[PDB]
Structure 1
Amino acid sequence: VLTQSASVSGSLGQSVTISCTGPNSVCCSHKSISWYQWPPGRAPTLIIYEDNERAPGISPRFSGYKSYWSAYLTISDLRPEDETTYYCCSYTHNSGCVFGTGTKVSV
């Protein structure tokens, strides 16, 4: 029910942005949005847990934001290790996690 950009591409040292939006009951107002780097066939990684807050050890070149109808994940200073699928989730303190449709960052 959470939709993202189908696919997206970038180049060296750039900044690729991915969207995450849905209905009012899924992605609107102040429901926390998390972003995971999730390479296909391996283990995920917490990139950004709270809307504007990252995970420890994450390179500072990853940023997150949330509008009133869509959340955005930005990857700056693109490096070859970023070429994976990324997924978002909507959650509150007790409500369960609702993942997204994913987005493959090309280069």
Structure 2
Amino acid sequence: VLTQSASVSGSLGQSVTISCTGPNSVCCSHKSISWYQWPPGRAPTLIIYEDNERAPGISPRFSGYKSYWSAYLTISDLRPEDETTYYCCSYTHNSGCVFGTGTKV
């Protein structure tokens, strides 16, 4: 129910921008948005939480933004290891991670 971008790509040095949106049930003003980098069938990785706060160690080229109707995730200056699938999650302080559909980058 939390629709992401279908798919998209770029080139080394360029940037991308994944989307994440949905109804009033899971988006956006009264919810937080986290961004997990999730290679298929492996240990995931937290990139950004609370709409735009990067997890410790995350490269600054990963960035988060949230409009009043859709949350974004820009991945600047691409590199080889970026070819993974990315999922957004909506959550509050006492709930669960409503994950997103998916986006192949």
TM-score by length of 1: 0.95
- After superposition, the C-alpha distances for 1:49-93 in whole angstroms (9 at most, x for unaligned) are 111210001111100000000000000000011000000000000
Q: Deviations over 1:11-70 (max 9, x none)?
A: 011110000000012112130000000001111000001112100011111000000000
In 1, Cα distance between equivalents of 2:28 and 2:82: 28
Residue 68 of structure 2: aligned partner: 68
Could you tell me which residue of structure 2 aligns to residue 23 of structure 1?
Answer: 23
Q: CA RMSD in A?
A: 0.9
Give the TM-score, by structure 2 length.
Answer: 0.96
* 1:41-60 equivalence runs, <5 A: 41-60=41-60
Secondary structure at the counterpart of residue 26 of structure 2? coil
Structure-2 separation of matches of 1:52 and 1:74: 10
Query: d(CA) in 1 for partners of 2:72 and 2:60?
Result: 16
Q: Structure 1 vs Structure 2: percent identity of aligned residues?
A: 100
How many residues were matched structurally?
105
Report the secondary structure of 2:74's partner residue.
strand
Q: Determine the C-alpha separation between the residues in 1 that align with 2:22 and 2:38.
A: 21
Q: By how many angstroms is 1:100 displaced?
A: 0.2
Which ranges in structure 2 are unaligned for 5 or more consecutive residues? Answer: none
